[PDB]
Each structure stands twice: as C-alpha cells, then as structure tokens.
Structure 1
Amino acid sequence: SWEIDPKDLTFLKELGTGQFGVVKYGKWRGQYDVAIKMIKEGSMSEDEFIEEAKVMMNLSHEKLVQLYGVCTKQRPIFIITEYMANGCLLNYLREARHAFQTQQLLEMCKDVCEAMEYLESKQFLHRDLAARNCLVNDQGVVKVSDFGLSRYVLDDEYTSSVGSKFPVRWSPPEVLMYSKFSSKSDIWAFGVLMWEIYSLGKMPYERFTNSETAEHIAQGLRLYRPHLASAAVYTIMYSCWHEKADERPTFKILLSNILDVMDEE
C-alpha cells in the first residue's frame, strides 16, 4: 500500500524548507530520485493527513507531482514524492538566463491546466495554487505540487484569511470575505498563476500590500496584462477573475482555450 519503508530511503542533499519543515533530495530503493518532506513536529494535522493520503495516492496524473508514499510509523513522518530536478517554478521563472519564448510560457500554463483539469474531474481542490507550489522537472515540464495539503497546516498565520502568510494575492473575493472555497476559487488562483508565468515571476500586485490587494479586487480591479501576454492570453487569465464565481470557466474550458491560442499563435 502507501507505506514506504524508511530503510528504503537514503537522504542525500537538502532542497529547502517550507510549511512542514525540511525537504531533502534522496534515493528510494537505491535507484529512484525522490524528494522527502520531513514533517516538522507541531506543523501538521498528521492523523488527518494519514487518513486522507489514501485518496491522495489515487490521484495520478502526468502533470501532478506523483506521491510515492508515506512513512508514518515514526516521527517525524515523511512524505515521499517524485523528484523535480529544476525545482520551484517561481525561481525558474525568475532566472533571466532561460530567456523563454512565449510559447514555452503558454506550455507551462497548459501543464498546470492539465493537472488542474484532472483535479477538477476528481472534484478535489488545491486551495493553494501558485507558482511557488509548482515544480519543474529535468525536461522543463511543470507539475502541480502539494495539492490539498493546506488542510493539514497547523500554523494559523497561513490558514486564517487575516494571517500574515495567507495567499491573499491568489484568492478570489469570496474566499477573502466569506471563506467561500470552491472549484472556482482554484480557477481564480489559476489565472493569477498564469500572470505569474507571463510576468516571469513577479509578485502579483507587486506595488500593493495584502490588504491593499483585497480592496483592489473587491473594487473589481484586476492584474494588468503582462507585457509578454497577448490579448488572447490575457483574456484567458482575466476570465478566471470574474466577480461572479459561477461565470469563471472550468479547467476543461481553460484547457481548450489555451490549446486554441497555441494553435493560433
């Protein structure tokens, strides 16, 4: 089943820290590259995550960071996933050396859209979609990471709408004002993620604070067109930010729009 034996793990180098503590690069069964999130005690609702990692092991898609398993008969617990050699998309976007063509940026958006369309087909929310939660493999393929792990974060700064680490800049109004989470809230975050990609990793609303961002969007104002985005590309991302949640497209619609732009441009 889902349970990896920790004897089958070697820890090689440190990849970074995030919400649940350290993440290490390693080998699984002396052959397979893996990332290993070592879960900082106190950071996670471990029993709920364990009980729900089963559902998560059934989420398998070409554009989702593949879960390989868990080590849960120990503390701290580990979570083993597919290794993504090119690391965080946000950093990737930020290195001027890649000198991306707009076609490669759109492929990045398509990668994430495929993953999210699959998630939507399973009626499973990400809740924290953003470039910082996307990874890049050795072939330049973008995959969506840590989908659904937000529910097991014990830090109130991250989970409360008013917390200092809440993804205010990726959230629709109805999340900020009413904690109304839905497939349409992931759609909103998706459009902001496209803006992140087309602006080569800028902070959304770069000149605003979080509070200023919430007022801006409640006044009905949105992110400006990144220079690199064509009118077609802007229309896609802007469609994700309709004030009425029910007028935002599905990931299935967004996918067919992205493929069309690819064909057209």
Structure 2
Amino acid sequence: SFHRVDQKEITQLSHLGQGTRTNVYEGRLRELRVVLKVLDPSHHDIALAFYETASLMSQVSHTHLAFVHGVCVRGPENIMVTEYVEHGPLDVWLRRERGHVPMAWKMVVAQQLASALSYLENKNLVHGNVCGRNILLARLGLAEGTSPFIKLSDPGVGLGALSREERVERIPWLAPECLPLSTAMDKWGFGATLLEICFDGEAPLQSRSPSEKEHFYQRQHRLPEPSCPQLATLTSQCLTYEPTQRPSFRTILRDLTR
C-alpha cells in the first residue's frame, strides 16, 4: 500500500551519496524538492523490504518525520521518492561545524528526536536505522533568536533483510540483540545517536575494523559516557545490553524536557 510515482513526474539531478544498497540523488517531483533513492540490482526479497519501508512510512505523520512520497518502478529499477530536507545530514554538518555547537542546541535536537520516537513507540512500529546520517536539518538554529529543527528520515531497506556483515557495519547504532523485531532496538539506536551528536558527529568505534566492532559486542563492553555531561545517566540506561531494562520513550522525553 504505497503511492506509485510515474517516471514523467520526476527529474534526476546530482548524486549526493550511497545509502544501504542505494545511490541517492537530488531531484524534483511534479513541484516538490525531493531525494531519489535508486536501489541496487537486487533479489526480489530486498525489493520487497524496500517497498515495505515506503508502505509503512506512508501511513504515519509527525512534525519530525521526513515525508515519503512513493516509489517509481521503471523496470527493473526501483526508486523511493522522499523529502529533501534543506540542510542535509546532521553527522556531516556537525563535523564541518565542530567546536561551534553549544550544548543547549544539542538538547533541543535530542528532545525533537525523542518526540518522533515516542510516536513510533505508541504506534508499535520499528524504525531500525536511527543514526546521524538519517537525522536531517530543516533549520540551523545557531543565529541569535533561533533554534534548530530536525527530521528523522525513513530507514531505507528494512533491517530484517540485511546481511550479518551489513549489521556489523551499523555498530554501534545497531542493538546488540539484533547481531545474531522489537521497538526496544530503537532505544539503543537513540542512545548511540546521542553519543554521536555529543562527539560532534564522531560515533564511538568508527575507526575500528568490522571484526573488532563485533568483538566489542561479544565481550559486552560498555560504551563511553557522553561529553554532554547532563546526558550520562540517560545514555547509559538506553545503551544496556538487556532490551527489557531500557526505559520507554515517554520516560526519555519526560527526562529530556527538564
């Protein structure tokens, strides 16, 4: 159950990057500013999972969830059409602007992200790809008199269909119980994303090889506590290996607002 987008209705512009089994381009939709996520040549089950993401994210709404417009099926190309959010991914922005972003700014985006994930929890819908790359900046909020505004993008190809190798590369955003689907995984993803934001877009463990990322989870080592000193109790509660011990998003949002 998703919108079929006819190929006459879209224009493809420049290449922005590569997502999980995708090439991502800027585009136009007749007009709206969009991103075009072109799937790799794939087995039908990967294409199904791609369609499933588009279907689920088409039937939810939130101020801090980016729009999904539909899928264009050119034969045998599959292209998801989604919102272009003006200032792009949070991780790249933070790295370019590092040492100019105050703590108070970071508290605002954490609250906004927790709001969106509170709604998804209430809807009992798994995201499965909460990370800096999928947080998009609609307003910058650094100028005097302003505050930032973010949007969480769709998860792309559903986590359930990816290979073990791909799951290892998503450490430490990936919930440990997903290494060998519940809404509990998104608590861990959220916690990992808060560390990423606090470290100015440098996630922990990203200078290490895949086998060393996996080994860290095998031993069950505890991730570092944030440079944002207020957040430490919260990130550690989110990043606990036992999923049932992680707090609800009602509790997370409540604690962040004060």
Question: In the alignment, is residue 200 of structure 1 matched against residue 211 of structure 2?
Answer: no
Cα distance in 2 between the residues matched to 1:38 and 1:242: 36
Between 1:143-152 and 1:113-122, the stretch displaced more is 143-152
TM-score, with length taken from structure 2: 0.84
- Asked if 1 retains the 8 angstrom alpha-carbon contact of 2:91 and 2:132, the reply is yes
Sequence identity (%): 27
In structure 2, the CA distance between the partners of 1:258 and 1:15, relative to structure 1 (3 Å rule), is same
Instruction: Give deviations 1:144-163, integer Å, cap 9, x for gaps.
Output: 2232633475xxxx521x55
Report the count of equivalent residues. 249
Matched-pair contact (CA < 8 Å) for 2:52–2:158: no
1:143 counterpart residue number: 151
State the shift of 1:236 in Å: 1.2
CA contact (8 A) 1:127 1:150 kept: yes
1:167-193 CA distance string (max 9 Å, x none): 1222333233xx4x4222211111011
> CA distance change for structure 1 residues 70 and 186 in 2, over 3 Å: closer, same or farther?
same
Residue in 2 aligned with 1:19?
20
The residue that corresponds to 1:263 in the other structure is none
> Structure 2 CA distance, aligned partners of 1:27 and 1:237?
39
**Would the aligned equivalents of 1:14 and 1:25 in 2 still touch at CA under 8 Å?**
yes
Cα offset for 1:34?
0.7
* Structure 2 equivalent of residue 182 of structure 1: 182
Report what 1:257 is aligned to. 255
Does the CA-based 8 Å contact 2:27-2:35 persist in structure 1?
Answer: yes
Runs of 4 or more consecutive aligned structure 1 residues displaced over 6 Å after TM superposition: none
- Aligned partner of 1:159 among 159, 163, 172: 163
Describe the shift of the 1:35–1:112 C-alpha distance in structure 2 as closer, same or farther (beyond 3 A): same
Residues 67 and 218 of structure 1: CA distance in aligned 2, closer, same or farther (over 3 Å): same
Q: Give the corresponding residue for 1:246.
A: 244
Q: Secondary structure at the match of 1:35?
A: strand
Within 1, Cα distance between the matches of 2:105 and 2:36?
29
Give 1:9's aligned amino acid.
I
Which residue in the other structure is 1:122 paired with?
123
| 8 Å contact from structure 2 (residues 192, 203) kept in 1 | no
The worse-fitting range, judged by mean Cα deviation, of 200-209 and 247-256 is: 200-209
Q: CA deviation at 1:12?
A: 2.4
Structure 2 gaps of 5+ residues are 141-147
CA distance in structure 1 between the aligned counterparts of 2:150 and 2:70, rounded to whole angstroms: 21
Q: TM-score, normalised by structure 1?
A: 0.82
CA distance in 2, matches of 1:237, 1:253: 13
